Amino acid sequence: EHCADEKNFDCRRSLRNGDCDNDDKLLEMGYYCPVTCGFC
DSSP: OOOOOOSSSOOHHHHHHGGGGGGGHHHHHHHHHTTTTTOO
């Protein structure tokens, strides 16, 4: 799976909010903005 942050999903805002620090949103972030979350 070559990961790529989504274009329509705002990865910066979500990172700034803390969406990616939320466990239940981890899944959401794993596909939406995985590169922004440093997964890959």
